[PDB]
Structure formats: C-alpha cells, structure tokens
Motif scaffolding. Sequence first.
Motif, mmCIF file in Angstrom:
data_model
loop_
_atom_site.group_PDB
_atom_site.id
_atom_site.type_symbol
_atom_site.label_atom_id
_atom_site.label_comp_id
_atom_site.label_asym_id
_atom_site.label_seq_id
_atom_site.Cartn_x
_atom_site.Cartn_y
_atom_site.Cartn_z
ATOM 1 N N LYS A 90 0.867 -1.178 0.000
ATOM 2 C CA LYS A 90 0.000 0.000 0.000
ATOM 3 C C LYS A 90 0.904 1.228 0.000
ATOM 4 O O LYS A 90 1.390 1.645 1.056
ATOM 5 C CB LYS A 90 -0.939 0.001 1.197
ATOM 6 N N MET A 91 1.125 1.795 -1.179
ATOM 7 C CA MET A 91 1.972 2.968 -1.298
ATOM 8 C C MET A 91 1.154 4.217 -0.984
ATOM 9 O O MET A 91 -0.067 4.245 -1.172
ATOM 10 C CB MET A 91 2.581 3.033 -2.700
ATOM 11 N N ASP A 149 -1.597 -3.475 -10.242
ATOM 12 C CA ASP A 149 -2.474 -4.613 -9.995
ATOM 13 C C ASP A 149 -1.734 -5.814 -9.423
ATOM 14 O O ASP A 149 -2.380 -6.726 -8.893
ATOM 15 C CB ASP A 149 -3.193 -5.008 -11.285
ATOM 16 N N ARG A 150 -0.403 -5.837 -9.501
ATOM 17 C CA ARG A 150 0.371 -6.973 -9.013
ATOM 18 C C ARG A 150 0.759 -6.831 -7.544
ATOM 19 O O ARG A 150 0.737 -7.820 -6.802
ATOM 20 C CB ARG A 150 1.628 -7.157 -9.870
ATOM 21 N N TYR A 151 1.103 -5.621 -7.099
ATOM 22 C CA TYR A 151 1.666 -5.432 -5.771
ATOM 23 C C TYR A 151 0.802 -4.620 -4.817
ATOM 24 O O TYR A 151 1.033 -4.690 -3.607
ATOM 25 C CB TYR A 151 3.048 -4.766 -5.869
ATOM 26 N N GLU A 152 -0.169 -3.856 -5.310
ATOM 27 C CA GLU A 152 -1.064 -3.120 -4.424
ATOM 28 C C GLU A 152 -2.096 -4.066 -3.826
ATOM 29 O O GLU A 152 -2.716 -4.857 -4.546
ATOM 30 C CB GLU A 152 -1.768 -1.989 -5.173
ATOM 31 N N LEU A 153 -2.281 -3.986 -2.505
ATOM 32 C CA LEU A 153 -3.324 -4.778 -1.863
ATOM 33 C C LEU A 153 -4.711 -4.335 -2.310
ATOM 34 O O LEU A 153 -5.644 -5.145 -2.330
ATOM 35 C CB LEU A 153 -3.199 -4.683 -0.341
ATOM 36 N N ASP A 154 -4.855 -3.060 -2.647
ATOM 37 C CA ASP A 154 -6.118 -2.492 -3.174
ATOM 38 C C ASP A 154 -6.089 -2.456 -4.709
ATOM 39 O O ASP A 154 -6.978 -1.871 -5.276
ATOM 40 C CB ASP A 154 -6.302 -1.053 -2.725
ATOM 41 N N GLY A 155 -5.201 -3.201 -5.378
ATOM 42 C CA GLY A 155 -5.139 -3.224 -6.823
ATOM 43 C C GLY A 155 -6.311 -3.961 -7.445
ATOM 44 O O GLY A 155 -7.176 -4.523 -6.771
#
Length: 453
Positions: free
Chosen positions: A363-364, A395-401
């Motif tokens: 989550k950046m 879409d690969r690394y965001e938890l909200d992706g």
Amino acid sequence: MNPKRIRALKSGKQGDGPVVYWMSRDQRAEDNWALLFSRAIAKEANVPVVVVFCLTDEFLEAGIRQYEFMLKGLQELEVSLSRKKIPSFFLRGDPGEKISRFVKDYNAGTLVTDFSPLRIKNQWIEKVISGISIPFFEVDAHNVVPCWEASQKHEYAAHTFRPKLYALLPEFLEEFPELEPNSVTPEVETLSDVLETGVKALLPERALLKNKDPLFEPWHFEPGEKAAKKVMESFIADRLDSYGALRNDPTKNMLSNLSPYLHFGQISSQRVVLEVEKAESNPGSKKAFLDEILIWKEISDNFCYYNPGYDGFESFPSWAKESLNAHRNDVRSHIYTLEEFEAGKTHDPLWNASQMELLSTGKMHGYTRMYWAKKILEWSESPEKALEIAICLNDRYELDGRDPNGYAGIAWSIGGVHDRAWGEREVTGKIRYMSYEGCKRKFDVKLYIEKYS
Ligand SMILES: Cc1cc2nc3c(=O)[nH]c(=O)nc-3n(C[C@H](O)[C@H](O)[C@H](O)COP(=O)(O)OP(=O)(O)OC[C@H]3O[C@@H](n4cnc5c(N)ncnc54)[C@H](O)[C@@H]3O)c2cc1C
C-alpha cells in the motif's frame, strides 16, 4: 430498502429453491445491500438464502499478499454467516461454469450478485446469463449512490460530478437494517486447503530480495471485517482531525488505511461515511476525507462503467490525446524496462523509495502514487507502454489493486482523466507535471527515502 439499488440483468421463471447471492466484490456480512436484498427476496418466497463465492483461475495473475488477505477474510466471514444460519459455498474454477452448475444442482430460485464495472466481471456475467433460466439481479453494494443513478454518462471532472452526488446523498445515505437470520438451516472444499494449494502455486513468483527473504510485510494490515472496523474507529479518533493537513505528507501515517478493506468489500464505504458525518472534528478535515471516499471513489466506478476502454489510450480526453500525440517522437530523458521499474532501479531515489513501499507494504502512499505513475509516463517509449507498466505494477503489488480506483487513478496521472490542461512540456505535453524539486518543497523527501531502503 430503495429499489434503485437493484437492477435486473435477466428475466426468467423463479424456481422454488434458495435465493443464491453470488458474492464477488463485497465480501462482508454487515452493511451489504446485495446480501440484504437477497435475504428480503428469500423471505418473500418462503425460501432460504445462500452465499456462493468463486475462487477464479485468475488468482495466479496477482501475488500471495492479495490471496492471503482475501482468503483470511473469507474464513472469518464463513463463521459470521454461519452464526446467521446462512451457509457459504466456495467454488473453484470458472464462474461461468460453476455458478450455472450450482444453480442447476441446487434448484436455485433467484440469483443475485453485487455490482462491479470491471471488464472481468462483465465477462462472468455474459457466461452466467447464457447458462441460467432463473431471474438474475445485481445490486450496487459498493457505492452510497448507485453507479447508474449518480450519473447517466461519463463525468469529465470532479466539479461536475460533485453536485450530482451530493444532491442525491439525502436519499441514499441511510442506516443499514439488521440482517435477519434464516428461519431454519437449509440442505466445494475447506478454505484452509485452498489457501495452502494456492500459496504453493504462487510461491515461485513471490517477491524476494537478494537474500532470498520475502519483501512483503503482512503485519501492516490485518484482514477481516472485525479488523476493518477497528481501523475505521482508529482513523476517526486519532487521524481524522489531521487528515486535511497531512494527507499529502508520505512521511506521516495520517491516512485512513481503509483501501485494502474497501477494495475487497470487507467494510462498507457508506458505513464509513455515516460514522464520519456524525463525528465532530475539523470541518476542513471532514470535507477533504469525504471528497475522497465519496467523490473520487465513486467517480472511479463512473469512469469504468461508462468507458469500456477505461484501461486504454482511447479513454483519455481529446486535449490529452492530442497533446500526447504531438509529443510522441520527443526524446525521452530515460527509458527503463518493466523489471527496472519493478525492482526500483531508476535514477530517481524518490521513485525507487515509492516502489519499495509498494513492494514491502502493498500500500503505497496516496501522494507518491501520483508521482510514481507520472514518472512512468516520462520514462516510457509511448503513453500506451506507460499505461501497461503502471497497470501491471499497480495490480500486481497493491493490496487495493485490480480496482476501479486504480484504473481511474492511473488514467488521471498519465492521461489527465478528470484533470485539466497545464503548461505544455516536452514528452509529457500538457499533462500535469510533478517534479522532484516540487516534492522536496512539500514534504521531507529524505525521510521517506531513508524509511524504504
Ligand atoms: C497511480 C495511482 C494508483 C492507485 N492505485 C489505487 C489502487 O490500486 N487501488 C485503490 O483502491 N486506489 C488507488 N489509488 C487511489 C489512492 O491512491 C488510494 O485509494 C489511496 O491511497 C488509498 O489509501 P488510503 O485508504 O490510506 O487513502 P485515504 O486518504 O484514507 O482515502 C480513503 C479512501 O478514499 C478513497 N480514495 C482516496 N483517494 C482516492 C483517489 N485518488 N481515487 C479514488 N479513491 C480514493 C479510497 O477509497 C480510499 O480508500 C490510486 C491512485 C493513483 C494516483
């Protein structure tokens, strides 16, 4: 119960079996309009309600961070639904084949699902419609105002969608009624085993550093409906008063951190708005937070719902497409590959630190998300390439992706969607530019870089 929240996807003859709630976007038992509407139809038909979730074949396109966050919340949900005498069935495979087979095997009377304007959900709806003969409804359980009711077309700016959404708030912003349990318990594997086999299939593509240790730190956000409420209460009591002034400072943890719960539907945005509206704090701090969770959040659904190519260059405004086309042949200062962006190996330490926060926490920070994407456009061979790179890493690394907020947020950063034209620069054109020197004048960039080595 407002009938404007429910839309008919297919007419048919109602069976005499249980009403099936095909859960997808809103994975929660409380404050769920789709589940409440399914329980009301079940009560009117003298029949029980059932919840069905599909574990799709596309989970291998993401990572372990999203597979564990979603399934650990489903394990808590299965208990919550069981206490209400509501059984949950978790199917594995194509929902075009599983939902149609589950409806026929269990003599389903009516099928209900939650709303999502994403392309992959529309793909499932077309497959399910062709293989069922019972009525099929969909309910907008994610937005306070239904997406088809807030606006009948694509809103090009937030100042055109804000008066429309606020004028309909007195009608749709209401308290949720209690979920009634099933009168009696009615008449395909354990989620613990599906989590084990799925993680084993995702292990070779796990994000690792040089020492073979994982990057992701799973202790930043605990999944579940109970943990989602605790995060909401902590934001109202400790962080809401300072949201309006520190929402743009990545060195401060002053955001609500509600996006991973809002994406998977573990908490309702209408529930958050209800608690914020009755909370006493800084008026400028409440106005800023409600502008993000209501306007910018539900305008992202409006962007995906009224633009079929929401992930393509053709959905940009005409002024941005003409500006980016006039600067296509401009010599880029740098050109990095997908793996160079993925590993944070750019000349910009602020961008690399932003990528490291995405890799480690999933989550950046909201402000650095705008810098992170706009620099991809500046250091890519074409605007189409920057769109693919930004969507892939988001879409690969965001938890909200894999969320309408991400595509509408990426479209704003690269294509100026819901933005305006700025000073014409090279390469980027009239797209809003964000410089490294401009970020240093806004927050302590050295603190944010040192935190994410
Ligand atoms: C390049 C880029 C990528 C993004 N990727 C995602 C994403 O993958 N998934 C995602 O849900 N959001 C995304 N956003 C929007 C925003 O960055 C995040 O929603 C926000 O950071 C979420 O963290 P938070 O809950 O602590 O923020 P908060 O300030 O506490 O806001 C709370 C909620 O308001 C909503 N919200 C806040 N800011 C925005 C926004 N700019 N657009 C839409 N809704 C907003 C969110 O639902 C958010 O959860 C992206 C934005 C950009 C510019």
